[PDB]
Design a protein around this nucleic acid. Structure first.
Ligand SMILES: [Mg+2]
Ligand SMILES: [Mg+2]
Ligand SMILES: [Mg+2]
Ligand SMILES: [Mg+2]
Ligand SMILES: [Mg+2]
Ligand SMILES: [Mg+2]
Ligand SMILES: [Mg+2]
Ligand SMILES: [Mg+2]
Ligand SMILES: [Mg+2]
Ligand SMILES: [Mg+2]
Ligand SMILES: [Mg+2]
Ligand SMILES: [Mg+2]
Ligand SMILES: [Mg+2]
Ligand SMILES: [Mg+2]
Ligand SMILES: [Mg+2]
Ligand SMILES: [Mg+2]
Ligand SMILES: [Mg+2]
Ligand SMILES: [Mg+2]
Ligand SMILES: [Mg+2]
Ligand SMILES: [Mg+2]
Ligand SMILES: [Mg+2]
Ligand SMILES: [Mg+2]
Ligand SMILES: [Mg+2]
Ligand SMILES: [Mg+2]
Ligand SMILES: [Mg+2]
Ligand SMILES: [Mg+2]
Ligand SMILES: [Mg+2]
Ligand SMILES: [Mg+2]
Ligand SMILES: [Mg+2]
Ligand SMILES: [Mg+2]
Ligand SMILES: [Mg+2]
Ligand SMILES: [Mg+2]
Ligand SMILES: [Mg+2]
Ligand SMILES: [Mg+2]
Ligand SMILES: [Mg+2]
Ligand SMILES: [Mg+2]
Ligand SMILES: [Mg+2]
Ligand SMILES: [Mg+2]
Ligand SMILES: [Mg+2]
Ligand SMILES: [Mg+2]
Ligand SMILES: [Mg+2]
Ligand SMILES: [Mg+2]
Ligand SMILES: [Mg+2]
Ligand SMILES: [Mg+2]
Ligand SMILES: [Mg+2]
Ligand SMILES: [Mg+2]
Ligand SMILES: [Mg+2]
Ligand SMILES: [Mg+2]
Ligand SMILES: [Mg+2]
Ligand SMILES: [Mg+2]
Ligand SMILES: [Mg+2]
Ligand SMILES: [Mg+2]
Ligand SMILES: [Mg+2]
Ligand SMILES: [Mg+2]
Ligand SMILES: [Mg+2]
Ligand SMILES: [Mg+2]
Ligand SMILES: [Mg+2]
Ligand SMILES: [Mg+2]
Ligand SMILES: [Mg+2]
Ligand SMILES: [Mg+2]
Ligand SMILES: [Mg+2]
Ligand SMILES: [Mg+2]
Ligand SMILES: [Mg+2]
Ligand SMILES: [Mg+2]
Ligand SMILES: [Mg+2]
Ligand SMILES: [Mg+2]
Ligand SMILES: [Mg+2]
Ligand SMILES: [Mg+2]
Ligand SMILES: [Mg+2]
Ligand SMILES: [Mg+2]
Ligand SMILES: [Mg+2]
Ligand SMILES: [Mg+2]
Ligand SMILES: [Mg+2]
Ligand SMILES: [Mg+2]
Ligand SMILES: [Mg+2]
Ligand SMILES: [Mg+2]
Ligand SMILES: [Mg+2]
Ligand SMILES: [Mg+2]
Ligand SMILES: [Mg+2]
Ligand SMILES: [Mg+2]
Ligand SMILES: [Mg+2]
Ligand SMILES: [Mg+2]
Ligand SMILES: [Mg+2]
Ligand SMILES: [Mg+2]
Ligand SMILES: [Mg+2]
Ligand SMILES: [Mg+2]
Ligand SMILES: [Mg+2]
Ligand SMILES: [Mg+2]
Ligand SMILES: [Mg+2]
Ligand SMILES: [Mg+2]
Ligand SMILES: [Mg+2]
Ligand SMILES: [Mg+2]
Ligand SMILES: [Mg+2]
Ligand SMILES: [Mg+2]
Ligand SMILES: [Mg+2]
Ligand SMILES: [Mg+2]
Ligand SMILES: [Mg+2]
Ligand SMILES: [Mg+2]
Ligand SMILES: [Mg+2]
Ligand SMILES: [Mg+2]
Ligand SMILES: [Mg+2]
Ligand SMILES: [Mg+2]
Ligand SMILES: [Mg+2]
Ligand SMILES: [Mg+2]
Ligand SMILES: [Mg+2]
Ligand SMILES: [Mg+2]
Ligand SMILES: [Mg+2]
Ligand SMILES: [Mg+2]
Ligand SMILES: [Mg+2]
Ligand SMILES: [Mg+2]
Ligand SMILES: [Mg+2]
Ligand SMILES: [Mg+2]
Ligand SMILES: [Mg+2]
Ligand SMILES: [Mg+2]
Ligand SMILES: [Mg+2]
Ligand SMILES: [Mg+2]
Ligand SMILES: [Mg+2]
Ligand SMILES: [Mg+2]
Ligand SMILES: [Mg+2]
Ligand SMILES: [Mg+2]
Ligand SMILES: [Mg+2]
Ligand SMILES: [Mg+2]
Ligand SMILES: [Mg+2]
Ligand SMILES: [Mg+2]
Ligand SMILES: [Mg+2]
Ligand SMILES: [Mg+2]
Ligand SMILES: [Mg+2]
Ligand SMILES: [Mg+2]
Ligand SMILES: [Mg+2]
Ligand SMILES: [Mg+2]
Ligand SMILES: [Mg+2]
Ligand SMILES: [Mg+2]
Ligand SMILES: [Mg+2]
Ligand SMILES: [Mg+2]
Ligand SMILES: [Mg+2]
Ligand SMILES: [Mg+2]
Ligand SMILES: [Mg+2]
Ligand SMILES: [Mg+2]
Ligand SMILES: [Mg+2]
Ligand SMILES: [Mg+2]
Ligand SMILES: [Mg+2]
Ligand SMILES: [Mg+2]
Ligand SMILES: [Mg+2]
Ligand SMILES: [Mg+2]
Ligand SMILES: [Mg+2]
Ligand SMILES: [Mg+2]
Ligand SMILES: [Mg+2]
Ligand SMILES: [Mg+2]
Ligand SMILES: [Mg+2]
Ligand SMILES: [Mg+2]
Ligand SMILES: [Mg+2]
Ligand SMILES: [Mg+2]
Ligand SMILES: [Mg+2]
Ligand SMILES: [Mg+2]
Ligand SMILES: [Mg+2]
Ligand SMILES: [Mg+2]
Ligand SMILES: [Mg+2]
Ligand SMILES: [Mg+2]
Ligand SMILES: [Mg+2]
Ligand SMILES: [Mg+2]
Ligand SMILES: [Mg+2]
Ligand SMILES: [Mg+2]
Ligand SMILES: [Mg+2]
Ligand SMILES: [Mg+2]
Ligand SMILES: [Mg+2]
Ligand SMILES: [Mg+2]
Ligand SMILES: [Mg+2]
Ligand SMILES: [Mg+2]
Ligand SMILES: [Mg+2]
Ligand SMILES: [Mg+2]
Ligand SMILES: [Mg+2]
Ligand SMILES: [Mg+2]
Ligand SMILES: [Mg+2]
Ligand SMILES: [Mg+2]
Ligand SMILES: [Mg+2]
Ligand SMILES: [Mg+2]
Ligand SMILES: [Mg+2]
Ligand SMILES: [Mg+2]
Ligand SMILES: [Mg+2]
Ligand SMILES: [Mg+2]
Ligand SMILES: [Mg+2]
Ligand SMILES: [Mg+2]
Ligand SMILES: [Mg+2]
Ligand SMILES: [Mg+2]
Ligand SMILES: [Mg+2]
Ligand SMILES: [Mg+2]
Ligand SMILES: [Mg+2]
Ligand SMILES: [Mg+2]
Ligand SMILES: [Mg+2]
Ligand SMILES: [Mg+2]
Ligand SMILES: [Mg+2]
Ligand SMILES: [Mg+2]
Ligand SMILES: [Mg+2]
Ligand SMILES: [Mg+2]
Ligand SMILES: [Mg+2]
Ligand SMILES: [Mg+2]
Ligand SMILES: [Mg+2]
Ligand SMILES: [Mg+2]
Ligand SMILES: [Mg+2]
Ligand SMILES: [Mg+2]
Ligand SMILES: [Mg+2]
Ligand SMILES: [Zn+2]
Lengths: 112, 116, 101, 16, 52, 59, 140
RNA sequence: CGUGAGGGAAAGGUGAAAAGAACCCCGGGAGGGGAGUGAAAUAGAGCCUGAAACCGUGGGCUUACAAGCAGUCACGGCCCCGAGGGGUUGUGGCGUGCCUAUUGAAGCAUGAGCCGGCGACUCACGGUCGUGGGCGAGCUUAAGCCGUUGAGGCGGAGGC
RNA sequence: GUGGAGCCUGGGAGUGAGGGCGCGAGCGAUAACGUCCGCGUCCGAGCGCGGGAACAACCGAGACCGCCAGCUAAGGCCCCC
RNA sequence: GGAUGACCCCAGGCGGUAGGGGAGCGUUCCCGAUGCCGAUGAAGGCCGACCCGCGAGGGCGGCUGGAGGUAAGGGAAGUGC
């Protein structure tokens, strides 16, 4: 049995959160929590909420046991980009892409 | 009536990209680059179909030569002998005999020396 | 016990039981044909000059077919020359039945 | 040695 | 391209913009521009011989 | 200067090869001997407030 | 019928006394043995040739005035980094390299040719350390 | 956008019906997970279909002594499918992108980041030759008129 | 001499910057990957194939497709090959 | 050859830029259509190692999709990047 959570349209750039996500793929729910807590990155805040919500899903909806949960899968997909103007010199206007992430955490049960 | 592109171009591009599976980077992913790759690929195939006939004959000849010198003569002398004896077994079969049926190959070497 | 036969301008080592794909023969499926013999081998060794007189290799033509397609493609740069041709080679499939020494 | 001068003195442009 | 609503102004200078050279945006090379040899209202009738 | 510029686009391979060193190193952590919680070493435990045997801080 | 392609065979070890033999004329044969083109089942895309052990490679012989005139050459990549070494001196300092260089140049370039080169074991002096493999004395 | 005359965009589609998701759970919210609606929910409103470039997760094969327009021909290994095929590629062989312009380009000469869509030999009238039919010392009507309302006739002025 | 010969009447063109090589001259310096004509050839359009290390025009030879068959051409046959 | 485009046989040609000629494929639309295919699934999309075609392409099959599509023969063009 698996349990998923997705945070869609989080305003952080995908390549950046993925760094944090990579840290907890395949980890126990317990280790992932400790890892995320002392990861000095903005993304850790977002990964944590998705992770903590999928846990809640597992326990509450899917008849899974907290003490057995581990991170079976996790990935970051790109959402639509917020496109903004960055004024450069000599009347030139650049476009900044303020990017977006769709963060998925999938939890399973480690038996035995 | 207006006859816009519609379906046609995409289908022609998939034709090509399908033929380019396995190619490196954009060569299997970009239609433009795939098409260029396939041009070269087709010319290579034509040319190498040709070269395969040569490539194999060379191998046969090398093998036949090794088997000849085991009986104290070289390929050129061997082939001349066979010609004088009127033995018309080709180099493909000769090389097979040279490896698989050494005693028969030995006999062929006999007739070879005897015909001169 | 094997023979080396000549069919379709090419030569092959054949043994009883062998299935051989060769150049298309003008013969009906199921029928049998006799292939020339250049050499016999195994126990007795007889050597053609070029073919051996008594011998023949009996073969039953299983049927006729076309080879899987080869794309023969021609291209010349800076000249807009491109040709695409589809080729399937005709063949005949044979069952080697016996060698007649 | 002083010979010809086959190019004008250059100056940078402005893309946009 | 002359029947299209756009202006006749040259959209940017001929040289030194680093872009392709263009005239007005009514040109058929532009999306939204005029069309080159599209249909114009015409009469398909023709006098077939009475005897025929 | 004369404004150096990339001569060719970097391939997916070549860009990703560059990033073969970009993986995060997980936080190094040790159990606090009092409350058994996981925290970085040589730091006052942020859960119970203990360090070097004594209560130091209000959590 | 398709052409025979051998399964991996136990390679043969071989011993050659280089003494008194002509450098290039010996090298030619050592290469052939290395390529295994003496074998009737030769295959160009695998190592199936012999292992060749050579002794008394310090007593290789050469014609003409090549002791003083043959130059072995090495470029280091640095400015003025072309070093020149005559035969005489190479024999005096690293005699096995003489026979090794000659043979190497008569092997194919590329990954396989490099492997075939490694199956060549050259020694100065009459003794070799590979009696364990029991190499078969060759007369060439 | 421009002082102004003036220039001048982009942007359509849930479902048959809002039945537009009560209520609970994690979350500050956004978002999601169950419950529920529906024939269908990767039809959930950022809504028909949902291609391509592009980014990612999982798996198979493969890669840290090797020389390159990236393929191709051969053989072997491994994985898959059920004397056969498909995927992968270790070694060996061969091998100078595409287009344009040129006497001559892989060319260190032009153009192109990549993908999708738009994008260039037409139409009228007259000519000339060919061709398919009609009539043939003749052939043919134009504007109009009548009729039809996707019906065809009349009309000889004129033209060859 | 029956040939993708030839002649006649029509329809449609493109081309009107050539280039290297051999031979015969001019110009040049009995220079030039020079220049300008003549005869021929090839490349152009055969940057398709073999040879010449590699290389449009030198040698060999005019590629409808297929074959893990045979003979040759130039060039080659000690090893790379 | 036989009766005439039925297919068989024998033979020869079949490198190709500018360019001339021929034969076809596909796109939109019209007649064929008050028809016919279609929720037992239209068009479009995504696969295929299968079939037919020299090729452009045409089928068939599985998934997707959810309401359109239109044959034999002809007609007309905003017809292939
Ligand atoms: Mg980060
Ligand atoms: Mg950290
Ligand atoms: Mg919980
Ligand atoms: Mg459940
Ligand atoms: Mg600034
Ligand atoms: Mg300013
Ligand atoms: Mg940006
Ligand atoms: Mg960016
Ligand atoms: Mg984004
Ligand atoms: Mg179209
Ligand atoms: Mg179009
Ligand atoms: Mg592909
Ligand atoms: Mg591949
Ligand atoms: Mg590539
Ligand atoms: Mg791609
Ligand atoms: Mg090709
Ligand atoms: Mg071929
Ligand atoms: Mg062959
Ligand atoms: Mg040949
Ligand atoms: Mg002969
Ligand atoms: Mg012969
Ligand atoms: Mg055996
Ligand atoms: Mg036959
Ligand atoms: Mg065959
Ligand atoms: Mg055949
Ligand atoms: Mg081909
Ligand atoms: Mg080109
Ligand atoms: Mg080329
Ligand atoms: Mg050209
Ligand atoms: Mg071309
Ligand atoms: Mg071209
Ligand atoms: Mg052309
Ligand atoms: Mg073509
Ligand atoms: Mg000057
Ligand atoms: Mg206007
Ligand atoms: Mg206006
Ligand atoms: Mg206007
Ligand atoms: Mg205007
Ligand atoms: Mg004006
Ligand atoms: Mg300009
Ligand atoms: Mg530019
Ligand atoms: Mg532009
Ligand atoms: Mg302009
Ligand atoms: Mg314009
Ligand atoms: Mg203008
Ligand atoms: Mg515009
Ligand atoms: Mg517009
Ligand atoms: Mg318009
Ligand atoms: Mg408009
Ligand atoms: Mg028109
Ligand atoms: Mg008309
Ligand atoms: Mg009319
Ligand atoms: Mg400065
Ligand atoms: Mg690049
Ligand atoms: Mg790129
Ligand atoms: Mg780059
Ligand atoms: Mg780079
Ligand atoms: Mg790439
Ligand atoms: Mg990647
Ligand atoms: Mg990555
Ligand atoms: Mg890099
Ligand atoms: Mg303590
Ligand atoms: Mg000697
Ligand atoms: Mg010797
Ligand atoms: Mg030997
Ligand atoms: Mg001597
Ligand atoms: Mg000497
Ligand atoms: Mg230096
Ligand atoms: Mg120095
Ligand atoms: Mg110096
Ligand atoms: Mg020096
Ligand atoms: Mg030095
Ligand atoms: Mg020094
Ligand atoms: Mg080589
Ligand atoms: Mg303003
Ligand atoms: Mg203003
Ligand atoms: Mg204003
Ligand atoms: Mg929409
Ligand atoms: Mg509605
Ligand atoms: Mg609706
Ligand atoms: Mg809350
Ligand atoms: Mg709460
Ligand atoms: Mg709450
Ligand atoms: Mg707040
Ligand atoms: Mg909510
Ligand atoms: Mg919900
Ligand atoms: Mg329901
Ligand atoms: Mg229901
Ligand atoms: Mg249904
Ligand atoms: Mg559902
Ligand atoms: Mg859902
Ligand atoms: Mg839907
Ligand atoms: Mg609808
Ligand atoms: Mg959708
Ligand atoms: Mg979507
Ligand atoms: Mg996609
Ligand atoms: Mg991808
Ligand atoms: Mg993986
Ligand atoms: Mg992967
Ligand atoms: Mg090394
Ligand atoms: Mg290695
Ligand atoms: Mg390599
Ligand atoms: Mg390699
Ligand atoms: Mg290369
Ligand atoms: Mg081979
Ligand atoms: Mg296989
Ligand atoms: Mg393979
Ligand atoms: Mg390779
Ligand atoms: Mg290779
Ligand atoms: Mg190449
Ligand atoms: Mg190479
Ligand atoms: Mg190259
Ligand atoms: Mg092209
Ligand atoms: Mg040019
Ligand atoms: Mg130019
Ligand atoms: Mg040029
Ligand atoms: Mg030029
Ligand atoms: Mg040149
Ligand atoms: Mg290059
Ligand atoms: Mg280039
Ligand atoms: Mg450059
Ligand atoms: Mg370059
Ligand atoms: Mg360039
Ligand atoms: Mg270039
Ligand atoms: Mg220019
Ligand atoms: Mg260009
Ligand atoms: Mg560019
Ligand atoms: Mg750009
Ligand atoms: Mg650009
Ligand atoms: Mg396009
Ligand atoms: Mg026209
Ligand atoms: Mg006309
Ligand atoms: Mg007419
Ligand atoms: Mg007529
Ligand atoms: Mg008529
Ligand atoms: Mg009349
Ligand atoms: Mg009326
Ligand atoms: Mg009516
Ligand atoms: Mg008139
Ligand atoms: Mg008159
Ligand atoms: Mg005659
Ligand atoms: Mg002719
Ligand atoms: Mg003619
Ligand atoms: Mg004439
Ligand atoms: Mg004429
Ligand atoms: Mg014409
Ligand atoms: Mg012209
Ligand atoms: Mg003129
Ligand atoms: Mg002129
Ligand atoms: Mg000129
Ligand atoms: Mg002229
Ligand atoms: Mg001239
Ligand atoms: Mg001239
Ligand atoms: Mg000429
Ligand atoms: Mg003179
Ligand atoms: Mg002189
Ligand atoms: Mg000249
Ligand atoms: Mg000269
Ligand atoms: Mg001269
Ligand atoms: Mg001439
Ligand atoms: Mg000439
Ligand atoms: Mg030209
Ligand atoms: Mg010619
Ligand atoms: Mg070249
Ligand atoms: Mg070549
Ligand atoms: Mg050549
Ligand atoms: Mg060459
Ligand atoms: Mg040539
Ligand atoms: Mg030249
Ligand atoms: Mg021919
Ligand atoms: Mg011969
Ligand atoms: Mg000769
Ligand atoms: Mg040579
Ligand atoms: Mg000789
Ligand atoms: Mg050899
Ligand atoms: Mg015929
Ligand atoms: Mg012809
Ligand atoms: Mg021909
Ligand atoms: Mg032709
Ligand atoms: Mg014609
Ligand atoms: Mg089409
Ligand atoms: Mg319709
Ligand atoms: Mg209708
Ligand atoms: Mg009705
Ligand atoms: Mg029905
Ligand atoms: Mg239904
Ligand atoms: Mg369905
Ligand atoms: Mg349609
Ligand atoms: Mg359709
Ligand atoms: Mg096909
Ligand atoms: Mg298809
Ligand atoms: Mg289907
Ligand atoms: Mg779907
Ligand atoms: Mg469908
Ligand atoms: Mg369905
Ligand atoms: Mg309806
Ligand atoms: Mg039709
Ligand atoms: Mg009709
Ligand atoms: Mg039709
Ligand atoms: Mg038209
Ligand atoms: Mg158009
Ligand atoms: Zn503590």
């Amino acid at each position: 049995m698996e349990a998923k959570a997705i945070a869609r349209y989080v305003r952080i750039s995908p390549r950046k959160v993925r760094l944090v996500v990579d840290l907890i793929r395949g980890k126990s729910l317990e280790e992932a929590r400790n890892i995320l807590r002392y990861t000095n990155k903005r993304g850790a805040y977002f990964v944590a909420k998705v992770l903590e919500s999928a846990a809640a899903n597992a326990v509450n909806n899917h008849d899974m046991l907290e003490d057995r949960l581990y991170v079976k899968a996790a990935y970051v997909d790109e959402g639509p980009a917020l496109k903004r103007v960055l004024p450069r010199a000599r009347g030139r206007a650049d476009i900044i892409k303020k990017r977006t992430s769709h963060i998925t955490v999938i939890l399973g049960e480690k038996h035995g | 009536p207006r006859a816009k592109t519609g379906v046609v171009r995409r289908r022609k591009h998939k034709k090509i990209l399908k033929l380019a599976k396995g190619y490196w980077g954009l060569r299997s992913k970009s239609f433009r680059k795939a098409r260029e790759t396939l041009f070269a690929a087709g010319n290579y195939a034509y040319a190498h179909r040709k070269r395969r006939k040569r490539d194999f004959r060379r191998l046969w000849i090398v093998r036949i030569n090794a088997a000849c010198r085991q009986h104290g003569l070289n390929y050129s002398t061997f082939i001349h002998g066979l010609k004088k004896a009127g033995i018309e077994v080709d180099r493909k079969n000769l090389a097979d005999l040279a490896v698989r049926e050494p005693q028969v190959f030995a006999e062929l070497v006999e007739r070879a020396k005897a015909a001169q | 016990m094997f023979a080396i036969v000549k069919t379709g301008g090419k030569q092959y080592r054949v043994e009883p039981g062998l299935k051989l794909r060769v150049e298309k023969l003008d013969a009906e499926p199921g029928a049998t044909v006799e292939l020339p013999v250049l050499l016999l081998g195994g126990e007795k060794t007889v050597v053609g000059t070029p073919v051996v007189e008594g011998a023949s290799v009996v073969a039953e033509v299983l049927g006729h077919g076309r080879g899987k397609k080869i794309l023969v493609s021609k291209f010349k740069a800076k000249v807009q020359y491109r040709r695409k041709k589809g080729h399937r080679q005709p063949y005949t499939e044979l069952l080697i039945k016996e060698i007649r020494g | 040695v002083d010979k010809g001068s086959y190019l004008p003195r250059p100056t940078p442009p402005r893309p946009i | 391209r002359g029947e299209v609503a756009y202006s006749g102004r040259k959209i940017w200078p001929q040289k030194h913009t680093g872009r392709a050279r263009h005239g007005d945006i009514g040109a058929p090379i532009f999306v939204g521009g005029g069309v080159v040899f599209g249909p114009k209202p015409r009469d398909y009738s023709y006098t077939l011989p009475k005897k025929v | 200067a004369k404004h150096p510029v990339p001569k060719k686009k970097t391939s997916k391979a070549r860009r990703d090869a560059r990033r073969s060193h970009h993986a995060l190193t997980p936080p190094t952590l040790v159990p606090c001997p009092e409350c058994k919680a996981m925290k970085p070493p040589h730091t006052v435990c942020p859960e119970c407030g203990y360090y070097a045997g004594r209560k130091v801080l209000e959590v | 019928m398709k052409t025979y392609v051998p399964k991996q065979v136990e390679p043969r070890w071989v011993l050659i006394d280089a003494e008194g033999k002509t450098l290039g004329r010996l090298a030619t044969k050592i290469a052939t043995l290395l390529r295994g083109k003496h074998r009737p089942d030769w295959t160009p895309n695998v190592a199936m040739g012999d292992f060749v052990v050579v002794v008394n490679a310090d007593k290789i012989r050469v014609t003409g005035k090549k002791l003083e005139q043959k130059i072995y050459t090495r470029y280091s990549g640095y400015p003025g980094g072309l070093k020149k070494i005559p035969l005489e001196k190479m024999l005096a300092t690293h005699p096995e390299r003489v026979l090794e260089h000659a043979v190497k140049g008569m092997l194919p370039k590329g990954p396989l040719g490099r492997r075939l080169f490694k199956r060549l074991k050259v020694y100065a002096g009459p003794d070799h350390p590979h009696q364990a493999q029991r190499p078969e004395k060759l007369e060439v």
